[PDB]
Amino acid sequence: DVNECISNPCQNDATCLDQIGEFQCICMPGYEGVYCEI
Q1: Buried b (16+ CB within 10 A) or exposed e, 1-38
Q2: Is 1 annotated as a binding residue?
Q3: What does the DSSP 8-state code read for residue 26?
Q4: Residue 36 and residue 12 in contact, taking contact as beta carbons nearer than 8 Å
Q5: Best CA proximity match to 13, nearest among 38, 34, 37
Q6: Cα→Cα distances 11→1, 5, 38, Å
Q7: 2 known ligand binder
């Protein structure tokens, strides 16, 4: 069932979040970046 959330594009410790065309890493309120890691 998994395909996009198998490697986790995140960098720190964020989770996966993709439906069809909107992938985003879930992080802590304060971490910036494209994949949550700043």
Answers
A1: eeeeeeeebbeeebebeeeeeeebbebeeebeeebbee
A2: yes
A3: B
A4: yes
A5: 37
A6: 23, 13, 9
A7: yes
